[PDB]
Amino acid sequence: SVHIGAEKGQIADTVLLPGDPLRAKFIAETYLENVECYNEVRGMYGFTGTYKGKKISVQGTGMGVPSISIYVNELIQSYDVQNLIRVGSCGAIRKDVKVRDVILAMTSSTDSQMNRVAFGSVDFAPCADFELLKNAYDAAKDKGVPVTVGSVFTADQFYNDDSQIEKLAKYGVLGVEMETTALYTLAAKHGRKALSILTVSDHVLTGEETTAEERQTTFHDMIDVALHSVS
Template sequence: GREISVMGTGMGIPSISLYSHELIHTFGVRNLIRVGSCGSMQEHVDLYDVVIAQGASTDSNYLSQFSIPGTWAPLSSYRLLEQAKRLADERGATSHVGNVLSSDIFYNADDQTLGKWARMGVLAVEMESAGLFANAAAAGVDALGIFTVSDHIPSGRRTTPAERETAFTTMIEIALEIG
């Protein structure tokens, strides 16, 4: 009984920022939920676990356009986050709520970089949430990121491409139930 639009947003903050801006300002979308894969940076966040992004740190320059005189931390919508966590718990999913890193760099030449973020308690790395959360905050709408761990960076374990196509349904089901 609800209208839901599902679309690809490309890869990275510039791409999702373009699409989310248009969804908000052209089409009037008020709730934006990103689903996707992430790489765990913490030992206790394992393959197939669900990560619900409370905040999104970034190494991107995207936030500079807002001319904020300091360091601003883009956060998700607590209303959507609370619903997602409740739904994950009801399903018995292993889920983690916290900070993610939205990185502009997929293959980093500095192999120490992710360890520095991990020491600060960042749960996982992905590439879009900071831009999505910033656009949503600037427009006064709600946004959330829900991820499935595809790579466990501390151990080097990874899911296969086939597993990524078929086994990441819990995060999608959670996103579809959020009202």
């Protein structure tokens, strides 16, 4: 639509959703064959190509609920996208979340008002598609890549003075990022399938960072789990 300059057919049934349009470029060129780039609108690149003879697209989302909602909306409405898989990172908020872990979000908490706007006095708990969830999980187990299944927290403010993540951590939440709630909610709304796969960028509470070498490895594992889940 408005935000994606592609012709129908240029986008696959399955799309991967990095936040960074350069991580989109990177993924495609490193992982896929016969790459075509279908969108340059706003520099939020989308690429279609193939992986083991099966078409896969990879589309930047931007940061925040309102940005990804745009792309997820159009991908669904204008291009009949069936599987949508966020591949990104999160800030870990618990010691037991290890920097090599690969996270599969079952659900997500949020301070985005997107759902309270739709639902009023209902707390809508979004939900990953289980078939995709299990595939990814199996793909990880099969190869021995360390994986954790629980929830994340989709923030509106990266810099947030009134952050309640200390309380979210006690309730089991694994980490913070900025897209999952939007993804899971829009996909379910339109009878599509979605899943969010995440790496640990750093520990937000211990302030402790992860090295460029740790980031590259888990990144590659993430893409692997995503691609192998779709085989």
